[PDB]
Nucleic acid binder design. Sequence first.
RNA 1: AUUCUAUGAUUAGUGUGAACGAAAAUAGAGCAGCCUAUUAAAAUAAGUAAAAUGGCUUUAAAGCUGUUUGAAUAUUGUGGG
RNA 2: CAGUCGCGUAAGCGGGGCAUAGGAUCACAAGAUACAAAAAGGAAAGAUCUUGGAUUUUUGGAAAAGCUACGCUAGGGAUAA
Lengths: 112, 62, 48
Amino acid sequence: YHRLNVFVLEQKPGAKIDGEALKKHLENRENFSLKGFREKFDLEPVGFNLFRSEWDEGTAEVMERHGIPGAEVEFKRQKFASLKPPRKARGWEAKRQKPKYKSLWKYVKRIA
Amino acid sequence: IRKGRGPSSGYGKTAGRGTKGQKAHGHVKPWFQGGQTPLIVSHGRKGFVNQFAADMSELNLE
Amino acid sequence: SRIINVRLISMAMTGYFYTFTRPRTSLPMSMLKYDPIVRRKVLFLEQK
RNA sequence: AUUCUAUGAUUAGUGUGAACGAAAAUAGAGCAGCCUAUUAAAAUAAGUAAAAUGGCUUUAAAGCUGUUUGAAUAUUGUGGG
RNA sequence: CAGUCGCGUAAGCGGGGCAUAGGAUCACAAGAUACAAAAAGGAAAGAUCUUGGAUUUUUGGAAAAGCUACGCUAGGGAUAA
Ligand SMILES: [K+]
Ligand SMILES: [K+]
Ligand SMILES: [K+]
Ligand SMILES: [K+]
Ligand SMILES: [Mg+2]
Ligand SMILES: [Mg+2]
Ligand SMILES: [Mg+2]
Ligand SMILES: [Mg+2]
Ligand SMILES: [Mg+2]
Ligand SMILES: [Mg+2]
Ligand SMILES: [Mg+2]
Ligand SMILES: [Mg+2]
Ligand SMILES: [Mg+2]
Ligand SMILES: [Mg+2]
Ligand SMILES: [Mg+2]
Ligand SMILES: [Mg+2]
Ligand SMILES: [Mg+2]
Ligand SMILES: [Mg+2]
């Protein structure tokens, strides 16, 4: 689930952000950092609210209307396989499992 | 490898058998594990073998 | 002898059961368990 | 049809186990059919088949058997498997 | 991960217990599974899953008392005269 944080920040007295300098900050910025943004305009966080959003049935159609790209992309959990090198099987039965011991296959095969 | 034909051959007196055990004097039963019960007796045999199933001769389109 | 193993039979008549232990000098067991045959939580009651 | 050899088969199967262990079929050796039997025999089989019980053999069937009991009469579907 | 339940405002937690002291198979029994069914239709007896009864306490799982100065054989001399 994605967290969407709604932040309300207070501007200092007599500090009006230029209407053209605010639309320039987001230019060529794909990792919006609240920390840096706040430090540049000397703002202060006062209020805040939260609401999450995950994949739902209406997600695909909402992307079509606004052209949001990334609909045909699904994420699968990364799988970590064991780091132990393969080892030869051990045991009386495991040794005698090749065609050599075909006469002893009644003790080695079809074990519960 | 002809065993029992001198020390220098490398297969001389004992003939690769060791020294006075059961593997030198006689023969050990193959199914024997020293006394410990086998796993097929500790777990049992699983399932059955279908003796009525037909043995088809598989043929593919490739 | 003091403790017995009872069988909690599903009341959906699906034939699934749960086995729990309880003392003889107590009341019969009765629980709300998950029946995997119908895949729903139903009422399970002691066999006898 | 029977007998002999191999394969089928350390198989099916049996047994707690260890082990034991078929048949169909295939190939080879031989080949032969009959009751009027090529050496002289049946008016087609009743205390029998079978059942209970005690054993044998065995896979529970079929087969052998002591004791006590006890059937039916042909494909116009009687009897065994 | 799937199934579907409890608690919680929510985040979330829950596949018994703060941790460390309760044995299988076979046989047998009760449920489910729909696999195979020795001519065929069924069945019996089998197969899978779940579960139960064990000083199976020699707890990797024999139903089990002694004597021999009359002792026998194969061995070792773990020191036994
Ligand atoms: K060798
Ligand atoms: K020696
Ligand atoms: K077998
Ligand atoms: K019989
Ligand atoms: Mg040497
Ligand atoms: Mg050697
Ligand atoms: Mg040795
Ligand atoms: Mg033992
Ligand atoms: Mg033969
Ligand atoms: Mg006759
Ligand atoms: Mg008879
Ligand atoms: Mg019969
Ligand atoms: Mg008969
Ligand atoms: Mg049948
Ligand atoms: Mg039959
Ligand atoms: Mg022990
Ligand atoms: Mg142990
Ligand atoms: Mg010494």
